[PDB]
Amino acid sequence: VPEPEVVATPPADAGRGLIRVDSREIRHYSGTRKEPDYLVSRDNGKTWEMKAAPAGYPPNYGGIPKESPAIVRNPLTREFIRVQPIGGFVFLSRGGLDGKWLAVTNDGKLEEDWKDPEKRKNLKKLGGIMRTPVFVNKGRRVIVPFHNMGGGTKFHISDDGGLTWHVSRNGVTSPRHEARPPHQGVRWFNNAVEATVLEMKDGTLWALARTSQDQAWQAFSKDYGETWSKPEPSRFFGTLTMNTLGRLDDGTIVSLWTNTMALPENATAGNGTWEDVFTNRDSHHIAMSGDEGKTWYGFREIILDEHRNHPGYATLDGPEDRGKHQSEMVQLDKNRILISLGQHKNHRRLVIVDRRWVGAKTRATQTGKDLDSQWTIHTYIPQKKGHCSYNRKPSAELVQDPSGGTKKVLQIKRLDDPELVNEKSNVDYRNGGATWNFPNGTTGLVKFRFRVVDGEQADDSGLQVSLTDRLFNACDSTTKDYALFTFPIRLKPAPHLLLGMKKVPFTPGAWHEISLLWQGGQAVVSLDGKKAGTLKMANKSPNGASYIHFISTGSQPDAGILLDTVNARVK
Amino acid sequence: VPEPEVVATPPADAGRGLIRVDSREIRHYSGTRKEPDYLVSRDNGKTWEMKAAPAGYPPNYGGIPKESPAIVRNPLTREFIRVQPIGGFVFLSRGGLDGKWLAVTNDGKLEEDWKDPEKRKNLKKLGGIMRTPVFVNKGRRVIVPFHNMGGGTKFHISDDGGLTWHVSRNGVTSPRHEARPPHQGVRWFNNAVEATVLEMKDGTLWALARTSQDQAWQAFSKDYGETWSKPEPSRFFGTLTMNTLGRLDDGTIVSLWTNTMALPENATAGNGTWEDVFTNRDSHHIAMSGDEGKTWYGFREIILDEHRNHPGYATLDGPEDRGKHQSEMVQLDKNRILISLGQHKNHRRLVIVDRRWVGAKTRATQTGKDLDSQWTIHTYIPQKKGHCSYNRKPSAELVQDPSGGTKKVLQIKRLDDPELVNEKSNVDYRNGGATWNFPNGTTGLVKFRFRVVDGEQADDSGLQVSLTDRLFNACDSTTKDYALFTFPIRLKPAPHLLLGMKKVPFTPGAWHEISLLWQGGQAVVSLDGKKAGTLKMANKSPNGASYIHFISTGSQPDAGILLDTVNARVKL
Ligand SMILES: CC(=O)N[C@@H]1[C@H](O[C@@H]2O[C@H](CO)[C@H](O)[C@H](O)[C@H]2O)[C@@H](O)[C@@H](CO)O[C@H]1O
Ligand SMILES: CC(=O)N[C@@H]1[C@H](O[C@@H]2O[C@H](CO)[C@H](O)[C@H](O)[C@H]2O)[C@@H](O)[C@@H](CO)O[C@H]1O
Ligand SMILES: CC(=O)N[C@H]1[C@H]([C@H](O)[C@H](O)CO)OC(C(=O)O)=C[C@@H]1O
Ligand SMILES: CC(=O)N[C@H]1[C@H]([C@H](O)[C@H](O)CO)OC(C(=O)O)=C[C@@H]1O
Ligand SMILES: OC[C@H]1O[C@@H](O)[C@H](O)[C@@H](O)[C@H]1O
Ligand SMILES: OC[C@H]1O[C@@H](O)[C@H](O)[C@@H](O)[C@H]1O
Ligand SMILES: [Ca+2]
Ligand SMILES: [Ca+2]
Ligand SMILES: [Cl-]
Ligand SMILES: [Cl-]
Ligand SMILES: [Cl-]
Ligand SMILES: [Cl-]
Ligand SMILES: [Cl-]
């Protein structure tokens, strides 16, 4: 099955501006303040180059330099509508993207002479931070989600193709974060911002929005966006990152988001007006549904941020927002989807995924071979740098397999590194760890191979092993508290698994395999091919397991454990 | 970055008398024949009011009512020297402008009792028409340029702070103007007069002087003013108007002048002893150099004369010399410069400019909005009035955009106005036109939008479009002969551009955009975004292009063309 393939870097942060022109040409526009331009592919997304837009295409009067306007085709007229992420005007095409453009006036007319600054004074200016215009109701209505950070999302609505506009009666909201353990402070408050909208087969609109909770929240409309239900938690985990919904030609729904859990808030997190530090923006994920959202599959990592481990992460090539959050998609053919994702010129990417890979039931890995592409291992230097960022270090390193040969394996231990401690913000990220994604399953079997390091160990040394439903940081010791299933490997007095109350001893200084076969609310744990015990599920999930998470447990520097292979198969 | 800002009217014509007192106080003295006075700002140039000078400050024994004495601070003693534009005495201060003043005697002493008429008979009297004392050679020498109208510039030199004086061996001269076409007569002869002097980094002195040629002329001294090189044309275009050079705190050189070309001389211009009529004094310009004059930028219009279009220009509130020629400068801070400029109470101004505006690389305009501030459009009623002046009319007028809406656009046509003709002096200023400044560039891109008026046209109707290196009058049909690049838009037999030998048709009844992209000795011309042709440079420039000039070409009354926007970008 074809793995995700990076094909280009878009010329703006992802989420707006990616637009199919025809069966072979796709463009990604930009937020340039100069003469407008775009990145273009003429081979259906495989190769790309920059090009200047023609003279009839309007400059970015609104928007910001790092984000393109959203550009959307009207399915009835086959023309395009363009709005900015913020500010500026509503432009409609006549003759396509390379034809004439007209700006919408306050009185519902079209202005051809928008190069005249006097004539721009009477142009319609839609308010708020906007996302993507979406045509609904057999193309007869267009709605544009917009938000205020603390006020919530509402919708700009037009019933005449964008000539005249009204605002929905209500929209989407979500509650403030409540500081309770393990948090020592409050998350940045976003009130159901950055909504994405999908029309369902029964005509309902589903709005999915970014929140300060552990998951995105959602609401529904029965009147094409004029009024919306009470909001509620969605099944898509994630916090303060963006969701995008789409639909393939065959009706399959695609959900793109950053399926992560941030680190608990620290003791200097601020009052929640703005963010203190981002600890959850280094991946992007995909899931699909063939039955109108009744069931979902996939929950696969599209990509991990290539810079995630590095001690200069926060400031390399300018401090602007960075990572793998935000996305937009264009279907390429029956199997392939093009995704623009991420923020910052060193991080944002155009990636081709294959739905057959989304639907796969197995995955395997070896830490020595696959660390850079597949393994989340970063810890943080807890000193805020750049714009709401931390620099990182790898929390674990590859070492020679003590059995000999050429294998390299991952040493997971409690680190002797004072730089990973901030006493004022009261955080200590010295426990090394590692986490790895696999296709989601409510029933599955995961096997991993590990070895106790021949070295000094602390009284509490070992490894907490968890199955989770989103990506928890490698250094997050609270993962077990949210996990679907979790148990410790304890090294002292002698090595053993603790499965409920049962202790299962095993030898140090030798490779061993542990299997977890989970189904419903129970997991059976095996050691070297022999049933060892069972685990009761610690937390229910709306989706199932899609990560295994390993973190050291020692509270003083130790030698820890080595991790070799992991494989997973789901039902 | 602010555009130039008028802040006051000085109490004398510009060029002498503007003097910084301290970090916040600046004064402009006057030529009053009564008790001396000055205009003063106590907020570093922003606001101004008149004040009487204190009792120790001498009256203007020399000079003339419309000009202040020059006042200059000695950088070593921190005291001041004062000389008149003509006549009078040499005064030195002891205790500053509001302290004691002493007059220099013929025998190199200082007279304290200059209020006594008897004692004034033995005071030193420097001859000629004098400009500004300048201290050179680490402040150890002071020199004062002086001239005779037909004899040339020389320098009064003192090596003891103004106590004793000698004259330079030579100075600056410049040739008489020659009456060759398009002239029908000779320009007023001035022999390198009104010099301004700047000390260069290497100790050379540069003198820049007003002439009867198309540009100021210059000469150089290697001995702090005793002897001067042969004279030569300078890079600063202009005729029979004043130059001023100065240097900012950071070493940047500033050149202020009137960057214009006068109309060709007419058939009754006289023998050149004195002027017949001034046709080039309605603007002032600035340029700067950070590399001791090797490279210059700016060439921007500081201001246009607000009265320039009017049919009573020559006589309003008295006929004395008027316009925007003559200037003097005082730096205000790192970015801003105060300039006194012009002549006549209704015309002379104190203006603050910003060096970041001087260094800008773009400008844009729309005729209907910007005509009064930015567009030179005047034609002349060719009847001499007042003192060497013509009354004017606007040669082009704003009309409704035919596309509809509130936009106004400028109609440029051959006028039916016999008042614009003088058959004895043989001039006919009935071709309307318009010209607009932009920052200098040896490379650049200028775009303008035009449309043919729906009306009857003559066989030669159209618009001659020129890029120039100084301001040519709106009604000057010879501009094309001096232009860096030029070409005609012709309306008959059908509308077309003529680019060399290539005819490029365009439609009537619609707006069109022409682009001119120049580099070196060629300009690429585009029409509505499509390359149309090329133009070879018609005349080289020492500086580059800083004006676009549009003039009607019809020789009988016609409907002409409309002009909407122009924009410019240089240093590509
Ligand atoms: C436009 C701008 O500079 N805004 C500043 C910052 O705004 C936002 O910060 C959040 C995180 O809190 C997020 O990264 C947004 O993308 C970003 O625009 C923010 O630093 C704020 C802090 O007081 O100041 C704003 O001016
Ligand atoms: C002092 C005076 O009245 N001078 C007369 C005039 O002199 C000068 O004229 C030139 C232009 O020719 C210029 O305008 C000077 O500023 C001005 O002083 C001039 O009219 C001259 C003509 O014969 O007679 C002078 O007496
Ligand atoms: C106009 C603006 O600020 N857009 C920003 C948006 C906004 O801050 C958030 O939606 C809360 O309002 O989020 C961020 C972000 O990476 O957090 C990137 C966008 O550029
Ligand atoms: C004493 C005197 O006449 N000074 C005049 C000066 C002089 O005529 C010229 O320098 C040729 O000598 O020029 C003029 C002028 O605007 O032309 C204004 C001065 O008041
Ligand atoms: O989760 C509750 C929601 O479930 C959806 O299937 C339905 O379309 C919504 O109207 C709402 O009932
Ligand atoms: O234009 C010629 C002049 O160039 C100057 O740089 C130099 O100082 C003068 O002495 C003279 O050579
Ligand atoms: Ca936070
Ligand atoms: Ca003359
Ligand atoms: Cl960018
Ligand atoms: Cl816009
Ligand atoms: Cl499909
Ligand atoms: Cl006066
Ligand atoms: Cl005097």
Residue numbers in the entry:
A (entry chain A): 25 to 595
B (entry chain B): 25 to 596
Sentences from the study reporting this entry:
Here, we describe the specificities of ten A. muciniphila glycoside hydrolases, which collectively remove all known sialyl and fucosyl mucin caps including those on double-sulfated epitopes.
Uniquely, AmGH181 displayed exclusive specificity towards the sialyl-T-antigen amongst the tested O-glycans, which was not hindered by α2,6-sialyation or β1,6-substitution of the GalNAc unit. To explain the strict specificity, we determined three structures of AmGH181: in ligand free form, bound with the transition-state inhibitor DANA (N-Acetyl-2,3-dehydro-2-deoxyneuraminic acid), and bound to both the T-antigen disaccharide (GNB) and DANA, which provides a mimic for a transition state-like substrate complex. This conformational change positions W298 to stack onto the GalNAc unit of the T-antigen, thereby defining subsite +2. Thus, W298 and H390 form a “sugar tong” that restricts the T-antigen disaccharide. The galactosyl at subsite +1 stacks onto an invariant tryptophan (W212) and is additionally recognized by two hydrogen bonds. An invariant aspartate (D345), unique for GH181, is hydrogen bonded to the Gal C3-OH group at subsite +1. Collectively, these aromatic stacking and polar interactions provide a plausible explanation for the strict specificity of the enzyme.
